[PDB]
Design a protein around this ligand. Structure first.
Ligand SMILES: [Zn+2]
Length: 98
């Protein structure tokens, strides 16, 4: 788990690089949402990982929100914080259960 200012995979900080990995994507969740939320696809099922915290997510379900799942599972992510803020992270945890 990375909660440092330094991205775990700085090479995926590049947006074009993340979006490349979603060139095709057969799963329910929108790929632009996934990319903006910091994820890139591993190329194995629906596994994605955050470039910053290195947090991985998989088994996506219809209606699931990439930023919400990002905050639910990896609330200490610095990229997540920079984009979404502490209020959002905390509210995700007040309304969700793991
Ligand atoms: Zn993250």
């Amino acid at each position: 788990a990375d909660s440092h200012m330094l991205p775990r995979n700085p090479s995926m900080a590049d947006y074009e690089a993340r979006i490349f990995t979603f060139g095709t994507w057969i799963y329910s969740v929108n790929k632009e949402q996934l990319a903006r939320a910091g994820f890139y696809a591993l190329g194995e099922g629906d596994k994605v990982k955050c470039f910053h915290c290195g947090g991985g997510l998989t088994d996506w379900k219809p209606s699931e929100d990439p930023w919400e799942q990002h905050a639910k599972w990896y609330p200490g992510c610095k990229y997540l914080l920079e984009q979404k803020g502490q209020e959002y992270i905390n509210n995700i945890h007040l309304t969700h259960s793991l």
